[PDB]
Amino acid sequence: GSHMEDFVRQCFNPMIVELAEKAMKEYGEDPKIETNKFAAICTHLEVCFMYSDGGSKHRFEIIEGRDRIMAWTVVNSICNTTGVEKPKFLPDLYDYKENRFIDIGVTRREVHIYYLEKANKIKSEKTHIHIFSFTGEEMATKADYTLDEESRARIKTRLFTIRQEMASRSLWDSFRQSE
Numbered sequence: 428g429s430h431m432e433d434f435v436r437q438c439f440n441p442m443i444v445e446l447a448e449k450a451m452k453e454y455g456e457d458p459k460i461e462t463n464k465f466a467a468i469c470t471h472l473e474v475c476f477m478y479s480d481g482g483s484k485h486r487f488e489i490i491e492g493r494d495r496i497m498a499w500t501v502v503n504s505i506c507n508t509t510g511v512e513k514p515k516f517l518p519d520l521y522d523y524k525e526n527r528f529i530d531i532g533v534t535r536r537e538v539h540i541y542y543l544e545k546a547n548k549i550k551s552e553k554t555h556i557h558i559f560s561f562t563g564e565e566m567a568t569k570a571d572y573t574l575d576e577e578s579r580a581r582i583k584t585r586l587f588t589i590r591q592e593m594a595s596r597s598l599w600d601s602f603r604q605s606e
């Protein structure tokens with residue numbers, strides 16, 4: 428029973444906690460043990476949901492937070508109706524306005540380090556990348572940040588509040604030094 432586990436459960440809403448638990452268990456991982464992983468998945472999930480709420484109604488299809496099979500099923504339907512190339516790895520959203528998949532990343536390092544890593548691995552030229560840090564920095568493919576500044580600002584604010592909350596509980600150092 429870790430302090431980080433209890434922090435996560437009282438920092439994120441239950442819908443996000445529940446989805447993060449399912450995601451970890453789907454790959455045989457325990458939120459009770461891999462607690463920094465637990466906190467990172469919850470954080471990333473909330474960012475994805477705030478991101479999808481930033482556009483017009485029906486702008487984004489949400490891929491994240493789904494079962495592996497249903498996630499690829501929705502990706503298949505999108506590709507087979509828009510003609511967009513199927514990505515090698517699961518993205519997080521699809522943008523019906525810009526007609527591209529989005530892989531969101533949240534990093535405790537400098538944004539550009541994590542971007543380079545995700546690009547190289549993704550190997551999907553068309554999949555748009557959007558990285559947020561816990562320091563208010565962001566980095567997006569082709570300097571195209573998709574959303575307007577106000578919707579990105581509230582994401583960056585939330586991420587910094589999570590950071591302060593961990594720090595006030597002496598959990599931030601372990602969280603940063605575990606990525």
Ligand SMILES: C[C@@H](N1CN([C@H]2c3ccccc3CSc3ccccc32)n2ccc(=O)c(O)c2C1=O)C(F)(F)F
Binds near residue numbers: 464468472530531533
């Ligand atoms: C399962 C899906 N994953 C993997 N993995 C994911 C995850 C989920 C369950 C168990 C382990 C891990 C690796 S740790 C981590 C840390 C923070 C947020 C998400 C995650 N990702 C890391 C960064 C992402 O941007 C992202 O989209 C994912 C993601 O979606 C996949 F694409 F592989 F099918």
Ligand SMILES: [Mn+2]
Binds near residue numbers: 491517518519
């Ligand atoms: Mn994802």
Ligand SMILES: [Mn+2]
Binds near residue numbers: 471530531532
């Ligand atoms: Mn992601």
